């Protein structure tokens, strides 16, 4: 209540405070507790193999230099005080681009406690790398992580833990990605060794399951409809050369445009995906349908009836094997 | 352990410290050791002729002004101390755009040693120029370098070396580019002379071998399938003018759309690539197939049978010569 008294107390705390030295410098490591509140996952990019996360990132640690007596309150201080305090040198090892939000002020909090506990909060948006296995795309499940580490302090000097254990990360229910469901999240703690020493690590990972629905509509269904279209040829008289050859060409070429378009939406991976396998199967069906007519055409100068039954049935077999293997 | 003692020692180190003067100013050059830990190569762009690298960049040098006694520890200091120290004026001569990561703090480390050795670490993402020879694209091998140099200090004042020799660069195994394999990396050291004097240089280069698989599927296979499609015409009766002319047109025009689309994904180079040679060969085959029908059409108002054998065989020869020359 007495602002001169509080001002005196805080001035005394910061008098001769050396930001260069961690709490308990030269002694046991400072334990830093970390909790995350997820605001959003804005984007997941296959082409860039990354995702964009917004979170409230909070760090908890005790600094005995900041302990104060005679005030039974937690002091919430203006965020600019953070520049006069030691804070951990935490970074995100797999981040590509990150920033602290700055409007209307730096989205930063400092709360001091009488025992010298410092609560330091930041609102961060990060684009973080996530290597994806697209062999089953778009029936794939991905593991995207956020790796949290101390940059310069080893485990001799700093230690990390998930504050609250399995409850340290909140807001996973808020994530609303149209193309993915969050199956699970996990929290891990370990030490990572480099040439410069052993460093504390915290890892947050998510299991993402792709929703098929968009892909059924966008790629699978057009391919099915083109393949069915190709079969119309077999009901046309063999003298209708222009009509039946037109059907063969248009379906074959449409399947090429669909294939090439699709792979321009994705990174230039050297392996075959699940969707590639489907499109290649569909291409073979429609190509053989045209070749069937070439064969009929070839001898006329029963086969059509045989095509009317065998082709749709074979496509059913193809689909059965495919969707069983991958679903 | 005694933080007042450590604070006193460090304050004494920085008292009267002149950041303007290099260590041993006016004396022998300061030797700066450099090690790199590669985190990722995010992107390789043919259109922009550049690549994006993320690395941990560490510099090692001795500054006798920072030597301290009576403390048998290496002092890890808050990264903000870097602003009160001399550091080398290292830059990347072939970089296009670079930044030091800034969340949650500047990804920077300072570790002092009792003898005055300074360890200075930065986490940097750089987009760096890489002129590519696309004459064999996409069967090409590229050499992309990172050129590290002192901006203003000559070899009279500063010297660079790879700290650890051939082990100075780690993490090459981490690089996971879908379109490339890292064949080799090399470390070079030399002096580079300009009008203003001789400057120390360190060069890190990689040999990148393009993976063919994506290109086989995306460009080569469609071209093969269009060329085969063109041959169907030869099994159609010569009276089927609409059917056979349709086949000729559609294949010819599809090969044009494939060509023009492809070169819109690449920079506007004035020379012919390997892929251009293939597409031009395929174009000639399908164009001649249509012209074959024009010739048949021309006289009817044996040639088809001759086309049925000679065309596929010639395409086999074309492919044999091509893939031997380039693979």
């Amino acid at each position: 209540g007495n602002m001169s008294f509080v001002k005196e107390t805080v001035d005394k705390l910061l008098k001769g405070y050396d930001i260069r030295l961690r709490p308990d410098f030269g002694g046991p490591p400072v334990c830093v507790g970390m909790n995350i509140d997820i605001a959003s996952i804005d984007m997941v990019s296959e082409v860039n193999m990354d995702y964009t996360l917004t979170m409230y990132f909070q760090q908890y640690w005790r600094d005995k230099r900041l302990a104060y007596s005679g005030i039974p309150l937690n002091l919430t201080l203006d965020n600019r005080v953070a520049d006069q305090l030691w804070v951990p040198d935490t970074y995100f090892l797999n981040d590509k681009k990150s920033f602290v939000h700055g409007v209307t002020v730096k989205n930063r909090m400092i709360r001091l406690h009488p025992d010298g506990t410092v609560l330091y909060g930041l609102r961060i948006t990060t684009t973080a790398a996530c290597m994806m296995d697209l062999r089953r795309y778009p029936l794939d499940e991905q593991n995207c992580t956020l790796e949290i580490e101390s940059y310069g302090y080893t485990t001799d000097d700093i230690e990390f833990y998930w504050r609250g254990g399995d409850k340290a990360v909140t807001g996973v229910e808020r994530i609303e990605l149209p193309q993915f469901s969050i199956v699970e999240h996990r929290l891990v703690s370990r030490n990572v060794v480099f040439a410069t020493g052993a460093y504390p690590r915290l890892s947050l990972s998510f299991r993402l399951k792709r929703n098929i629905g968009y892909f059924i509509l966008q790629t699978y269904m057009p391919s099915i409809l083109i393949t069915i279209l190709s079969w119309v040829s077999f009901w046309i008289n063999y003298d209708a050369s222009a009509a039946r050859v037109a059907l063969g060409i248009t379906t074959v070429l449409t399947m090429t445009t669909i294939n090439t378009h699709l792979r321009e939406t994705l990174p230039k991976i050297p392996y075959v995906k699940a969707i590639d396998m489907y499109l290649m199967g569909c291409f073979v069906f429609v190509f053989l349908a045209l070749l069937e007519y070439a064969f009929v055409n070839y001898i006329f100068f029963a086969i059509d009836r045989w095509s009317r039954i065998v082709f749709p049935f074979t496509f059913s077999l193809f689909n059965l094997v495919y969707w069983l293997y991958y679903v | 352990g005694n933080m007042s003692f450590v604070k006193e020692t460090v304050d004494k180190l920085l008292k009267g410290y002149d950041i303007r003067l290099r260590p041993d100013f006016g004396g022998p050059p300061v030797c700066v050791g450099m090690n790199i830990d590669i985190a990722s190569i995010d992107m390789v762009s043919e259109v922009n002729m550049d690549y994006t690298l993320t690395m941990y960049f560490q510099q090692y040098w001795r500054d006798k002004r920072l030597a301290y006694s009576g403390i048998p520890l290496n002092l890890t200091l808050d990264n903000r101390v870097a602003d009160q120290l001399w550091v080398p004026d290292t830059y990347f001569l072939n970089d296009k755009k670079s930044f030091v990561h800034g969340v949650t703090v500047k990804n920077r480390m300072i570790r002092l040693h009792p003898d005055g050795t300074v360890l200075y670490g930065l986490r940097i993402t750089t987009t760096a120029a890489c002129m590519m020879d696309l004459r064999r694209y996409p069967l090409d091998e590229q050499n992309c370098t990172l050129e590290i140099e002192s901006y203003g200090y000559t070899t009279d004042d500063i010297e660079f070396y790879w700290r650890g020799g051939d082990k100075a660069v780690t993490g090459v195994e981490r690089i996971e580019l879908p379109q490339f394999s890292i064949v080799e990396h090399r470390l070079v050291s030399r002096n580079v002379v300009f009008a203003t004097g001789a400057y120390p240089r360190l060069s890190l280069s990689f040999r990148l071998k393009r993976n063919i698989g994506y290109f086989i599927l995306q460009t080569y296979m469609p071209s093969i399938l269009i060329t085969i499609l063109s041959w169907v015409s030869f099994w159609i009766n010569y009276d089927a003018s609409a059917a056979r002319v349709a086949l000729g047109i559609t294949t010819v025009l599809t090969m044009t759309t494939i060509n023009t689309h492809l070169r819109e994904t690449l920079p506007k180079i004035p020379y012919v690539k390997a892929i251009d040679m293939y597409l031009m060969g395929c174009f000639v085959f399908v164009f001649l197939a249509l012209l074959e029908y024009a010739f048949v059409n021309y006289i009817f108002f044996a040639i088809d049978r001759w086309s049925r054998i000679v065309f596929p065989f010639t395409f086999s020869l074309f492919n044999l010569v091509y893939w031997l020359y380039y693979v």
Epitope: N94, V192, V193, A195 | E173, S181
Partner: nanobody
Framework: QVQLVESGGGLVQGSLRLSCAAS????????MGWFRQAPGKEREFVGA????????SYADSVKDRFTISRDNAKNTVYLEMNNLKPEDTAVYYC??????????????????WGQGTQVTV
């Protein structure tokens, strides 16, 4: 979740080919390492290979003697131990490293350890 079974050790006087067959979530663990533990001595780095690319690294002791490579079809890594020596007498272990799990050289960075073939010469 990775399982590693290694075989082809034994006792010889000579060229040898240790093999290391992986199964499971190998995507999350792109690096395979070879370690060896002599009786008494600490567990020691031999070499490592990326599954994708085959980017290879060796300890000095075995540089230009041993050769590692793999085949992604079988999910198998092999240590081709040529030009053997009586120093090369240890339980050779195979292990998998996570993508972000630190330096190649340090066995504590590795999660999934093979059984370990004893090799004496």
């Amino acid at each position: 979740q990775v399982q590693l079974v290694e075989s082809g050790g034994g006792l010889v006087q000579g060229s040898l080919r240790l093999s290391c067959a992986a199964s499971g979530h190998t995507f999350n663990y792109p690096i395979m390492g070879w370690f060896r533990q002599a009786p008494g001595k600490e567990r020691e780095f031999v070499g490592a290979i990326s599954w994708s690319g085959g980017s290879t690294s060796y300890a000095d002791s075995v540089k230009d003697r041993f050769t590692i490579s793999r085949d992604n079809a079988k999910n198998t890594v092999y240590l081709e131990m040529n030009n053997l020596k009586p120093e090369d007498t240890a339980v050779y272990y195979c292990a998998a490293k996570g993508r972000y799990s630190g330096g190649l050289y340090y066995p504590t960075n590795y999660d999934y350890w093979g059984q370990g073939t004893q090799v004496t010469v």
